[PDB]
Amino acid sequence: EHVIIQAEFYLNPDQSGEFMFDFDGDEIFHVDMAKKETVWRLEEFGRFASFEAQGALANIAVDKANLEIMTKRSNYTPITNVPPEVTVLTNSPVELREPNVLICFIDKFTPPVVNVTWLRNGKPVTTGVSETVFLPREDHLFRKFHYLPFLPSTEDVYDCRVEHWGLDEPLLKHWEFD
Amino acid sequence: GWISLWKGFSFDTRPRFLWQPKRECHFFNGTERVRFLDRYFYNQEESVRFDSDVGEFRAVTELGRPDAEYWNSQKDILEQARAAVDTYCRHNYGVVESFTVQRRVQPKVTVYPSKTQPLQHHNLLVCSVSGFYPGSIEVRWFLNGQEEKAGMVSTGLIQNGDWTFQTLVMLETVPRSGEVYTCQVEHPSVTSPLTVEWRA
Ligand SMILES: *[C@@H]1O[C@H](CO[C@@H]2O[C@@H](C)[C@@H](O)[C@@H](O)[C@@H]2O)[C@@H](O)[C@H](O[C@@H]2O[C@@H](C)[C@@H](O)[C@@H](O)[C@@H]2O)[C@H]1NC(C)=O
Ligand SMILES: *[C@@H]1O[C@H](CO)[C@@H](O)[C@H](O)[C@H]1NC(C)=O
């Protein structure tokens, strides 16, 4: 029993579009719209399969034209914001001075527009951080993961700060060694 | 192989408008039984759907009613959709099967005491199971050959987003000397169960 999902979206007025394949909840690849490029979630995947990113660029164009038809047909009914719920966890049990990874899991939100910042002791961090694209859910909200490799210690505390139009205030989820 | 996409068919406080195509391929017993769905979502609301088990397009809301009727009248569009289980689902299955259906990553299992709150003596044994794939897993606690079934809390299956999973299963217990606790893990990456013992 397995499920493969081709999930796309186009968002107005932001003019944002994404295209990705999902296998049992994990991302196989997405298409970098700017770079016209297929980006495999694990590098090894590209050594076993291929995808023409041009086709995804063409699908996004059709998605845009379909969106504008349906926007007019709905008399410009807008989407209801649904704010995310945010969880910060580690890749594995945390041991001091042993490298680990902080995961910021942003879940159950729409539209797929979010601002995410890692904070160490209140200061924004951008070194080594990575992120996924907007992943699908069965209830058609979105998921997203942000990652921050870190060296655990008693001195550093961490926050994942998440901004979304459905939120009144920035959502900060704390992490510290216990 | 080359993954083929499904092309589909044609129909700050300022408002947003969102279009979400979803092309689903559901596989049962490999590609023995396959189900294809072509789903179109406007602002999180499904408008029109093709379900291969139905054989024709159906409007989920009134917003999709024109396109379901028009697409159902087109012989060529309809036969493209009814063929998708073969031209699309079964094709992509053969392309990705070796590194998706067959992917197996072994869990790392560790046991350590913990505390529910600031207390003096540990009142939790934690079985940490991390880094495994796929997500199907069973974690059981044993106390000297007797399976402890009461007093357990689990995080549930945690998806790390990087093709690995994680789970923690806490056993509520103040360990007594001479007690041997066993965490047992069953996962398709190993042929036998995994066991990790902890002693007070
Ligand atoms: C979009 O508005 C269409 C007309 O504008 C309004 O007309 C009525 C409802 C009134 O409120 C007036 O002040 C507005 O200008 C309206 O016709 C359309 O309804 C849809 O199309 C009609 C022809 C019917 O099929 C009806 O069942 C539909 O809902 C409005 N669209 C929607 C999606 O509601
Ligand atoms: C993200 O930050 C930019 C810059 O201020 C802002 O324009 C945008 O609205 C923000 N998005 C949110 C808060 O969802």
Side-chain angles (χ1 to χ4, degrees):
Chain A
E1 189 143 317
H2 298 283
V3 184
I4 301 175
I5 296 183
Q6 175 186 321
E8 322 166 23
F9 75 82
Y10 194 94
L11 176 69
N12 271 337
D14 305 75
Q15 295 186 334
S16 292
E18 290 192 344
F19 181 107
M20 64 85 69
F21 263 65
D22 178 291
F23 175 88
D24 288 352
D26 282 291
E27 172 195 352
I28 299 169
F29 72 92
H30 68 270
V31 166
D32 194 287
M33 296 306 152
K35 296 158 60 185
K36 191 177 70 178
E37 198 186 306
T38 303
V39 186
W40 302 92
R41 181 63 180 86
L42 302 184
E43 195 168 353
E44 34 180 306
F45 291 170
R47 301 192 297 262
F48 305 110
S50 317
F51 179 77
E52 187 39 79
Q54 251 303 323
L57 267 62
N59 260 41
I60 294 302
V62 174
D63 296 339
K64 177 183 173 71
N66 283 338
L67 174 55
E68 268 139 41
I69 295 176
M70 302 292 310
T71 299
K72 175 186 163 164
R73 194 188 293 175
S74 80
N75 290 341
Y76 298 86
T77 302
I79 194 182
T80 292
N81 297 320
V82 179
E85 55 172 64
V86 179
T87 306
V88 173
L89 62 150
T90 56
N91 202 22
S92 64
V94 46
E95 301 204 330
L96 299 162
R97 306 177 297 271
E98 171 180 337
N100 207 315
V101 182
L102 277 173
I103 302 165
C104 184
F105 178 43
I106 306 126
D107 196 22
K108 300 175 191 173
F109 64 95
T110 196
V113 183
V114 73
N115 288 332
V116 184
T117 53
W118 286 104
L119 303 172
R120 180 196 310 159
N121 305 322
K123 316 187 192 354
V125 195
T126 63
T127 60
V129 301
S130 61
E131 70 192 66
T132 73
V133 292
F134 292 95
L135 309 181
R137 294 174 43 84
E138 277 188 355
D139 57 17
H140 319 303
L141 302 164
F142 292 92
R143 303 178 280 143
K144 197 185 194 87
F145 297 87
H146 279 243
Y147 304 99
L148 170 60
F150 75 114
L151 206 69
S153 70
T154 58
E155 303 154 353
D156 293 333
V157 303
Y158 290 87
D159 302 279
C160 181
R161 175 163 61 83
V162 169
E163 294 171 8
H164 191 271
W165 295 319
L167 287 167
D168 295 287
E169 57 113 40
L171 199 45
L172 270 86
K173 278 297 183 289
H174 192 75
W175 184 92
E176 69 194 358
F177 188 90
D178 67 322
Chain B
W2 286 83
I3 295 171
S4 59
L5 80 170
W6 183 254
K7 183 165 172 300
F9 316 100
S10 302
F11 284 59
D12 207 337
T13 65
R14 61 204 162 116
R16 259 64 186 185
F17 313 94
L18 177 62
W19 184 250
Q20 275 176 99
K22 289 196 171 169
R23 281 84 193 211
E24 313 181 359
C25 292
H26 298 247
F27 306 96
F28 314 88
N29 198 286
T31 59
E32 176 192 326
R33 201 202 180 274
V34 178
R35 180 193 182 195
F36 170 73
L37 290 112
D38 192 14
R39 315 178 69 188
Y40 298 93
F41 295 83
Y42 173 76
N43 292 345
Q44 206 194 345
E45 306 172 3
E46 194 167 11
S47 62
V48 50
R49 162 197 311 193
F50 175 86
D51 187 341
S52 67
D53 288 342
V54 177
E56 60 172 16
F57 295 86
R58 295 283 175 84
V60 178
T61 64
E62 281 299 319
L63 209 59
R65 194 157 301 269
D67 310 275
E69 298 181 344
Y70 176 57
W71 287 338
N72 284 335
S73 68
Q74 290 293 333
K75 153 181 173 288
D76 41 272
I77 291 175
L78 193 48
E79 91 176 316
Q80 287 295 313
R82 293 174 180 170
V85 170
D86 294 317
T87 65
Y88 174 64
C89 296
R90 277 182 181 109
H91 173 67
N92 289 341
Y93 191 96
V95 175
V96 311
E97 163 259 334
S98 64
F99 56 93
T100 57
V101 178
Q102 304 302 338
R103 165 174 252 259
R104 298 285 190 271
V105 180
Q106 212 220 116
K108 178 165 181 181
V109 187
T110 70
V111 176
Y112 59 89
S114 180
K115 296 180 182 179
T116 52
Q117 53 163 288
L119 298 166
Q120 199 186 338
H121 194 280
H122 295 108
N123 68 339
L124 294 172
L125 277 181
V126 177
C127 188
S128 178
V129 189
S130 61
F132 54 92
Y133 193 93
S136 281
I137 202 157
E138 288 286 315
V139 182
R140 301 181 163 95
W141 271 112
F142 290 85
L143 177 51
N144 303 333
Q146 290 147 269
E147 190 181 344
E148 205 66 50
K149 313 208 87 186
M152 306 180 47
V153 174
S154 173
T155 63
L157 201 62
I158 295 173
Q159 201 162 32
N160 295 328
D162 64 347
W163 293 78
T164 59
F165 291 85
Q166 159 184 12
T167 181
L168 302 154
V169 179
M170 284 65 75
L171 177 68
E172 296 160 357
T173 177
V174 178
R176 268 59 175 86
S177 192
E179 283 177 330
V180 179
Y181 292 87
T182 312
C183 180
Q184 178 182 75
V185 176
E186 294 164 18
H187 189 258
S189 69
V190 296
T191 298
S192 68
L194 302 174
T195 60
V196 175
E197 280 184 336
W198 182 95
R199 296 167 178 95

